[PDB]
Design a binder for this molecule. Structure first.
Ligand SMILES: *[C@@H]1O[C@H](CO)[C@@H](O[C@@H]2O[C@H](CO)[C@@H](O[C@@H]3O[C@H](CO[C@H]4O[C@H](CO)[C@@H](O)[C@H](O)[C@@H]4O)[C@@H](O)[C@H](O[C@H]4O[C@H](CO)[C@@H](O)[C@H](O)[C@@H]4O)[C@@H]3O)[C@H](O)[C@H]2NC(C)=O)[C@H](O)[C@H]1NC(C)=O
Ligand SMILES: *[C@@H]1O[C@H](CO)[C@@H](O[C@@H]2O[C@H](CO)[C@@H](O[C@@H]3O[C@H](CO)[C@@H](O)[C@H](O)[C@@H]3O)[C@H](O)[C@H]2NC(C)=O)[C@H](O)[C@H]1NC(C)=O
Ligand SMILES: *[C@@H]1O[C@H](CO)[C@@H](O[C@@H]2O[C@H](CO)[C@@H](O[C@@H]3O[C@H](CO)[C@@H](O)[C@H](O)[C@@H]3O)[C@H](O)[C@H]2NC(C)=O)[C@H](O)[C@H]1NC(C)=O
Ligand SMILES: *[C@@H]1O[C@H](CO)[C@@H](O[C@@H]2O[C@H](CO)[C@@H](O[C@@H]3O[C@H](CO)[C@@H](O)[C@H](O)[C@@H]3O)[C@H](O)[C@H]2NC(C)=O)[C@H](O)[C@H]1NC(C)=O
Ligand SMILES: *[C@@H]1O[C@H](CO)[C@@H](O[C@@H]2O[C@H](CO)[C@@H](O[C@@H]3O[C@H](CO)[C@@H](O)[C@H](O)[C@@H]3O)[C@H](O)[C@H]2NC(C)=O)[C@H](O)[C@H]1NC(C)=O
Ligand SMILES: *[C@@H]1O[C@H](CO)[C@@H](O[C@@H]2O[C@H](CO)[C@@H](O[C@@H]3O[C@H](CO)[C@@H](O)[C@H](O)[C@@H]3O)[C@H](O)[C@H]2NC(C)=O)[C@H](O)[C@H]1NC(C)=O
Ligand SMILES: *[C@@H]1O[C@H](CO)[C@@H](O[C@@H]2O[C@H](CO)[C@@H](O[C@@H]3O[C@H](CO)[C@@H](O)[C@H](O)[C@@H]3O)[C@H](O)[C@H]2NC(C)=O)[C@H](O)[C@H]1NC(C)=O
Ligand SMILES: *[C@@H]1O[C@H](CO)[C@@H](O[C@@H]2O[C@H](CO)[C@@H](O[C@@H]3O[C@H](CO)[C@@H](O)[C@H](O)[C@@H]3O)[C@H](O)[C@H]2NC(C)=O)[C@H](O)[C@H]1NC(C)=O
Ligand SMILES: *[C@@H]1O[C@H](CO)[C@@H](O[C@@H]2O[C@H](CO)[C@@H](O[C@@H]3O[C@H](CO)[C@@H](O)[C@H](O)[C@@H]3O)[C@H](O)[C@H]2NC(C)=O)[C@H](O)[C@H]1NC(C)=O
Ligand SMILES: *[C@@H]1O[C@H](CO)[C@@H](O[C@@H]2O[C@H](CO)[C@@H](O[C@@H]3O[C@H](CO)[C@@H](O)[C@H](O)[C@@H]3O)[C@H](O)[C@H]2NC(C)=O)[C@H](O)[C@H]1NC(C)=O
Ligand SMILES: *[C@@H]1O[C@H](CO)[C@@H](O[C@@H]2O[C@H](CO)[C@@H](O)[C@H](O)[C@H]2NC(C)=O)[C@H](O)[C@H]1NC(C)=O
Ligand SMILES: *[C@@H]1O[C@H](CO)[C@@H](O[C@@H]2O[C@H](CO)[C@@H](O)[C@H](O)[C@H]2NC(C)=O)[C@H](O)[C@H]1NC(C)=O
Ligand SMILES: *[C@@H]1O[C@H](CO)[C@@H](O)[C@H](O)[C@H]1NC(C)=O
Ligand SMILES: *[C@@H]1O[C@H](CO)[C@@H](O)[C@H](O)[C@H]1NC(C)=O
Ligand SMILES: *[C@@H]1O[C@H](CO)[C@@H](O)[C@H](O)[C@H]1NC(C)=O
Ligand SMILES: *[C@@H]1O[C@H](CO)[C@@H](O)[C@H](O)[C@H]1NC(C)=O
Ligand SMILES: *[C@@H]1O[C@H](CO)[C@@H](O)[C@H](O)[C@H]1NC(C)=O
Ligand SMILES: *[C@@H]1O[C@H](CO)[C@@H](O)[C@H](O)[C@H]1NC(C)=O
Ligand SMILES: *[C@@H]1O[C@H](CO)[C@@H](O)[C@H](O)[C@H]1NC(C)=O
Ligand SMILES: *[C@@H]1O[C@H](CO)[C@@H](O)[C@H](O)[C@H]1NC(C)=O
Ligand SMILES: *[C@@H]1O[C@H](CO)[C@@H](O)[C@H](O)[C@H]1NC(C)=O
Ligand SMILES: *[C@@H]1O[C@H](CO)[C@@H](O)[C@H](O)[C@H]1NC(C)=O
Ligand SMILES: *[C@@H]1O[C@H](CO)[C@@H](O)[C@H](O)[C@H]1NC(C)=O
Ligand SMILES: *[C@@H]1O[C@H](CO)[C@@H](O)[C@H](O)[C@H]1NC(C)=O
Lengths: 144, 471, 144, 144, 101
């Protein structure tokens, strides 16, 4: 399950997430064995080039993607766990469906084939409503 | 009641920034499909949706003389020049001695205008050695040159004297990479994360001081960053009123910036056709010689509508009464250097030094009709140059190429930079005059509204609530 | 109103907080379009120079700024959300005031103006005083 | 106490952690004071080589290790603060020894080296066997 | 890292410097010259071996064909005599030249 772990699943792969999250920000693993301080064996010329700055800026852009992801997560106030649900349901705008049969006949990709017309709706609606609607404190029912 | 100190996040906060803004451009700079037109380093394209949001009921002091954007700006410009100069081959063998003839088989040798540009006709053509692709072989090739880029030597004072380049005896020279252009492109400097740019939208706002009509912005508007001495070309307009600015308006050395609300069709032009000859020196060394032009060859000159100049002068002198009701005189710069004495700019690669001497010949002391009623179109002499040492640094020099064809530079002027006289009287008669040694003010003359600011989203305030407590 | 739209508002500025943080680290949206990978317009030589590398450095420095922010928020127990309660009452050093005039008669700018020096103190309090004396849970009452 | 205040301690060491962290992660103020923009006093050529780009790369790699640390904190639900227990009981792989004398006479390394691999395997176990076994709710007694 | 960064900084500082490729051209040095002292305070096989010579050679202006003679001073450590010929005949050559750039 390095990058696999779901041949055809919608609910079984709902708990296999940790294996791939372990490697989401693991750019250092392959990098540790580089010995790139300036040289490896005795000596060399500068030799860091379009290749080097390409891998460097690639690591930068990947890290930037991840940072934007965690920013989006934090905005939702739902960062306490990967599998976190919502206080609002989805508008029944697709075809009238069935949870069971929908959870059997797709490799977590067919659901995404009817969302380009519904991505921003979900995204902005949750990001605004589920975020702003958190008041501060409770008043009456406590220890005292 | 109690001042329980609570923290908040997500509200603007303003502090001075020291960071970098980035490229922007339209499809033309990348649809041209030349290696790089004149900012192009795989530069980011522009943002078609400038989110320039307006804010009110706030205020801030703004200054363009304390601004850091100009320093980084000219540093990045010099970087552009150097990076474009890397592919340019070296022209040290081009510095070799050259023997010239002044007169040639041209129909005209002294053109119709005479303003000390035809007396010093400054047109000659010279032969000289260059290397063949075989090192054992060299060959004499000939081209055309003026007298400004060279000087006489071996002073047998006048018998077919040889010449030498002005910049070779002190500095190095290299090709201009003729495949790259020299015209500007609409730029929009963009803000990275953690910063913003505030445009002062006050229509009445002069150079520095307090401004309130705020426009918070991420990316600037269309900029045309072209170099000009004494003048502002292809720039923005003055909204609502003629803009007059100066660092210390009492002090005289501080130059005076002028932004008009009315443009002029400045056509500095070489109509007579040009020539180009690509000649192989070595394996990569290919020189672009100025060939022998066919036909009538008149000296390149320039044109302006002096009538619009007169009416805009009426406007600005009606505005220039800082402490006055009627006194002004203009005088030309009594000395300096050609790089600062004239209105110098770049156009189609050629460095046009157009001579803005038509300003000072005027006495607008009290009345404006006497110089407004003579509505007349001005013709002036404008010199041409091939080489340059931008920003007065003596280092690597650029050799601009032939432009074969004709050269037109029709443009809109919008502003000026001047200086008041040094040893001037107290109230007898104020004098102004042109100055162009400060190449830096030309860039802040449009970013005067723009100020770069950091972003510290942290905020704090007291309230009566409190966080969780155990006992 | 993407980042500002608080001209004269302090109490009214206690509700439009999230519209600012939505676009805080979104310079990536301005950066992803660079197309500086090897070449954009036709072609380029190595041509990866002070502009690109120090743009990358500015990305790095803004990232480090907001990461040091996020970690000192976490020190404050403050990464949960923007509104961030504290157990810290202000020591009696400011002049007379009202709970609303401070919250009504400014635009989020006059506050940081007049609280320049004192601010540091509060940090260490919320950095230390709120943290060390925090305990785990209660003992006595429960569902049964 | 950047790293000091613990020669052989677990109580004082556990009390002197925040000082160590806030002194360790003060490198951003060193980075702000670089002032290497183009030129230091008079004039410089480019002068940006493997030295500087790999200064930034070392910044990236160390902070990436820290990014993985925050990833770990998000995995274990351990992102609240440093005071963060674990639902696992320590297996008997260790050899007989008393608790407070380990707190007082192992300086946190004489323990770690002996429990180094067991720290790694129990890291894996606390990552796998902890978060997957969180129930959803209880309906017997609630707010309503 | 210390020696690596040292050599790297020395390279980077070597870049802006000017070059001396045409300065490498052949030379002719006179040892005995217009000077009075030859025996310094110390005599340990270093004063008679005064290791000081005044030496001429050609150089080039910024142009190609323009060449002019010029003289300077050199020690014995920088150059070596071409004993390949019959004798010295005032014939010397730089060693850093005829090994590297
Ligand atoms: C740069 O310039 C010259 C031209 O090629 C070269 O420099 C060195 O030249 C010498 C001789 O020309 C090379 O060999 C050494 O010669 C020393 C003196 O010369 C005697 O020996 C030669 C035969 O080798 C005779 O022809 C000559 O008449 C002399 O009798 C010798 O002393 C060396 O041997 C030993 O001497 C020293 C000092 O006593 C001992 O400490 C050593 O153990 C050493 O073995 C040697 O024979 C010498 O090799 C050349 N240097 C180098 C680096 O090669 C350079 O070659 C030239 N640069 C390049 C790149 O070619
Ligand atoms: C371009 O050439 C024309 C002539 O072809 C110039 O006009 C002439 O300029 C001369 C010199 O200034 C005038 O002569 C002078 O007259 C004054 C008295 O006014 C006298 O004091 C001087 O000693 C000298 O003799 C001449 O009258 C004048 N002629 C005409 C028809 O204009 C013109 O000035 C030249 N262009 C420029 C920019 O100078
Ligand atoms: C640009 O506009 C500002 C107003 O927004 C002008 O402000 C100038 O402000 C000064 C001080 O507030 C006025 O008084 C002067 O103060 C200085 C000391 O600072 C003193 O030495 C002088 O004798 C004078 O009292 C000044 O009158 C005022 N200027 C004007 C024109 O009213 C600023 O001058 C404007 N700058 C330019 C270049 O137009
Ligand atoms: C300097 O440049 C400006 C603009 O770049 C020139 O303005 C334009 O000049 C042309 C002729 O050179 C005008 O076209 C002509 O207009 C007349 C009168 O309407 C008409 O009878 C002709 O058939 C021809 O269409 C053009 O209208 C004018 N632009 C505007 C907006 O009016 C200017 O002429 C240039 N000056 C010199 C001395 O080259
Ligand atoms: C600036 O504008 C002026 C006037 O618009 C240009 O002057 C041009 O001057 C030449 C001679 O120096 C004139 O050539 C002759 O013109 C007459 C009358 O048109 C014609 O019959 C002759 O056969 C001959 O072509 C030319 O006409 C005249 N241009 C105009 C539009 O009248 C001057 O070239 C412009 N450019 C500068 C100063 O760079
Ligand atoms: C830039 O343009 C100005 C004028 O627009 C030039 O200044 C003027 O140049 C002319 C020609 O050199 C001067 O005429 C002089 O007339 C006297 C009369 O005796 C004669 O003896 C001189 O030999 C000379 O021809 C004129 O006085 C002068 N100043 C004005 C009109 O105020 C200036 O030379 C131009 N500079 C460049 C670099 O093109
Ligand atoms: C623009 O020029 C006009 C004249 O073309 C100026 O108006 C008039 O100027 C004359 C002479 O300067 C004034 O004459 C005066 O007469 C009295 C005696 O009554 C004498 O004592 C004075 O020394 C002077 O010679 C005339 O009064 C004046 N008229 C007006 C209505 O102003 C005009 O002032 C000029 N523009 C400006 C802004 O000054
Ligand atoms: C502005 O330029 C136009 C041409 O582009 C000039 O047109 C004509 O210019 C002459 C003199 O240069 C004027 O002559 C005078 O006319 C007035 C009547 O307006 C008369 O009272 C005078 O005795 C003299 O004859 C001519 O009128 C004028 N054309 C028109 C239709 O007015 C014009 O003069 C230039 N204006 C100025 C102030 O220089
Ligand atoms: C100030 O802005 C104006 C407006 O764009 C510039 O005028 C235009 O300049 C461009 C070149 O910079 C001209 O295009 C060129 O035309 C030649 C003709 O052979 C062609 O070979 C080039 O590939 C290029 O297309 C354009 O014709 C010209 N006029 C317009 C747009 O009406 C002006 O050049 C700017 N100022 C300066 C000093 O350049
Ligand atoms: C540094 O100084 C030493 C000290 O002179 C140099 O080493 C050698 O020193 C011995 C002294 O025992 C010299 O020996 C001489 O031998 C002759 C003949 O037997 C004798 O008459 C003298 O009284 C003396 O003992 C020997 O010449 C000398 N070597 C040289 C090359 O001069 C050493 O060379 C010096 N190193 C440097 C880098 O200057
Ligand atoms: C200056 O230009 C003239 C242009 O005529 C050169 O002379 C021409 O040289 C070509 C080359 O073969 C001949 O075909 C023409 O017949 C020549 N014309 C005349 C009028 O002589 C002249 O050689 C050039 N001189 C220098 C020093 O560049
Ligand atoms: C921290 O406080 C000091 C002093 O309290 C501030 O110094 C101000 O300095 C100016 C000119 O020296 C005085 O006119 C002010 O009265 C001073 N402020 C006060 C409150 O007295 C200093 O600027 C403050 N630090 C920051 C970053 O604002
Ligand atoms: C939700 O669905 C209903 C019924 O199909 C439709 O009328 C409405 O426009 C939808 N709203 C959104 C935001 O999709
Ligand atoms: C301020 O900017 C607004 C743009 O929303 C404009 O309507 C208003 O006229 C401006 N006011 C001034 C004084 O510039
Ligand atoms: C330019 O501004 C002045 C005010 O200084 C005004 O009188 C003139 O009409 C304006 N001209 C325009 C907008 O063309
Ligand atoms: C401007 O300069 C004058 C003298 O040159 C001086 O008296 C005055 O104080 C200066 N004002 C400012 C604001 O620098
Ligand atoms: C001369 O000018 C004409 C423009 O009418 C141009 O077509 C021709 O090519 C030019 N002659 C050259 C470049 O030799
Ligand atoms: C302005 O008037 C003065 C008279 O004092 C005169 O000397 C000067 O030449 C006049 N200006 C011009 C441009 O002729
Ligand atoms: C100059 O201004 C005119 C109108 O005033 C405009 O049509 C033309 O495009 C402008 N040219 C420039 C900015 O180059
Ligand atoms: C400033 O404008 C009005 C009038 O002062 C005020 O009510 C408003 O809150 C302020 N902010 C704006 C217009 O953005
Ligand atoms: C707290 O307030 C008291 C009285 O207002 C003052 O004496 C003391 O210095 C203050 N201490 C701090 C840390 O602000
Ligand atoms: C050093 O301090 C005391 C005295 O030696 C000792 O008891 C303690 O264990 C040592 N280590 C520390 C304080 O870390
Ligand atoms: C640890 O050191 C303390 C103080 O010296 C001592 O009381 C205790 O017995 C020691 N425990 C060991 C060595 O296990
Ligand atoms: C000079 O030479 C003499 C004899 O050869 C010797 O005694 C003396 O020490 C030498 N001087 C020095 C400074 O070595």
């Amino acid at each position: 399950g390095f990058l696999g772990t779901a041949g055809s699943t919608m609910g079984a792969a709902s708990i296999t997430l940790t294996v791939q999250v372990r490697k989401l920000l693991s750019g250092i693993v392959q990098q540790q064995s580089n010995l790139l301080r300036a040289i490896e064996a005795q000596q060399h010329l500068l030799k860091l080039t379009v290749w080097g700055i390409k891998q460097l800026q690639a690591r930068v852009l990947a890290v930037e993607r991840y940072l934007r992801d965690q920013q989006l997560l934090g905005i939702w106030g739902c960062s306490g766990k990967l599998i976190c649900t919502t206080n609002v349901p989805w508008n029944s705008s697709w075809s009238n469906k069935s949870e069971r049969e929908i959870w059997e006949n797709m490799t977590w990709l067919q659901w995404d084939k009817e969302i380009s017309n519904y991505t921003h709706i979900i995204y902005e609606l949750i990001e605004e409503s589920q975020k702003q609607q958190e008041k501060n404190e409770q008043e009456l029912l406590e220890l005292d | 009641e109690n001042l329980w100190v609570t923290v908040y996040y997500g509200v603007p906060v303003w502090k001075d920034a020291e960071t970098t803004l980035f490229c922007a451009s339209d499809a033309k700079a990348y649809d041209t499909e030349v290696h790089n037109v004149w900012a192009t380093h795989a530069c980011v394209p522009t943002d078609p949706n400038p989110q320039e949001i307006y804010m009110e009921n706030v205020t801030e002091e703004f200054n363009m003389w304390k601004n850091n954007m100009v320093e980084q700006m000219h540093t990045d410009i010099i970087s552009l020049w150097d990076q474009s100069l890397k592919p340019c081959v070296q022209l040290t063998p081009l510095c070799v001695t050259l023997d010239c003839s002044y007169n040639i088989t041209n129909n005209i040798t002294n053109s119709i205008t005479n303003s000390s540009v035809n007396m010093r006709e400054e047109i000659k053509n010279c032969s000289f050695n260059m290397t063949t692709e075989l090192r054992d072989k060299n060959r004499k090739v000939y081209s055309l040159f003026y007298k400004l880029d060279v000087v006489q030597i071996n002073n047998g004072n006048n018998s077919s004297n040889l010449y030498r380049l002005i910049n070779c005896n002190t500095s190095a020279l290299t090709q201009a990479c003729p495949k790259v252009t020299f015209e500007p492109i609409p730029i929009r400097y963009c803000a990275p994360a953690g910063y913003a740019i505030l445009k002062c939208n006050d229509k009445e706002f002069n150079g520095t001081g307090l401004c309130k009509n705020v426009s918070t912005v991420q990316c600037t508007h269309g900029i045309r960053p072209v170099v000009s001495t004494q003048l502002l070309l292809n720039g923005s307009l003055a909204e609502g009123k003629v803009m007059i600015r100066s660092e210390n308006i009492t002090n005289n050395v501080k130059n005076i910036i002028v932004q008009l609300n009315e443009t002029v069709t400045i056509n500095c032009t070489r109509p007579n056709n040009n020539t180009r000859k690509s000649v192989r020196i070595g394996p990569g060394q290919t020189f672009y010689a100025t060939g022998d032009i066919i036909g009538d060859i008149r000296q390149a000159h320039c044109n302006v509508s002096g009538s619009q100049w007169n009416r805009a002068l009426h406007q600005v002198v009606g505005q220039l009464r800082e402490y006055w009701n009627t006194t002004i005189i203009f005088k030309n710069s009594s000395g300096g250097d050609l790089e600062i004495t004239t209105h110098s700019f770049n156009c189609g690669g050629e460095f046009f030094y157009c001579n803005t001497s038509g300003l000072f010949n005027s006495n607008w002391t009290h009345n404006d009709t006497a110089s407004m009623k003579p509505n007349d179109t001005i013709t002036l002499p404008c010199r041409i140059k091939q080489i340059i040492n931008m920003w007065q640094r003596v280092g690597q020099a650029i050799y601009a190429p032939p432009i074969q064809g004709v050269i037109r530079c029709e443009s809109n002027i919008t502003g000026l930079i001047l200086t008041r006289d040094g040893g001037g009287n107290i109230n007898e008669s104020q004098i102004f005059r042109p100055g162009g040694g400060d190449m830096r003010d030309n860039w802040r003359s449009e970013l005067y509204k723009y100020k770069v600011v950091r972003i510290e989203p942290l905020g704090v305030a007291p309230t009566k609530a409190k966080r969780r407590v155990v006992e």
